[PDB]
Write a protein that binds this ligand. Structure first.
Ligand code: ADP
Length: 73
């Protein structure tokens, strides 16, 4: 239903991997405040109240955004 993206240091947007985007979307759809995500051996908090990804070790916050997926399932 959705493709979530995160913003890099050059200001460019990157799609989350497919399963991570599913995890984020499912939490967003039910109104969660936040969901934890692990990728690349890192742990991120996805904070829906601020629409940011937060690295739980470094404190870096990055913007996230949601695009609709047109593709019919
Ligand atoms: N969800 C993500 N998936 C893959 N790479 C990411 C993701 N978020 C950030 N990055 C990249 O990984 C590196 C580390 O980013 P981050 O975890 O935010 O820590 P920091 O910037 O504090 O070192 C950067 O190159 C960044 O662009």
């Amino acid at each position: 239903g959705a493709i979530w993206q995160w913003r890099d240091d050059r200001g460019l947007w990157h799609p989350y991997n497919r399963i991570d985007s599913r995890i984020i979307e499912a939490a967003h759809q039910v109104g969660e405040d936040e969901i934890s995500l692990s990728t690349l051996g890192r742990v991120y908090t996805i904070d829906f109240n601020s629409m940011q990804q937060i690295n739980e070790d470094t404190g870096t916050a990055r913007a996230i955004q949601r695009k609709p997926n047109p593709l019919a399932n």
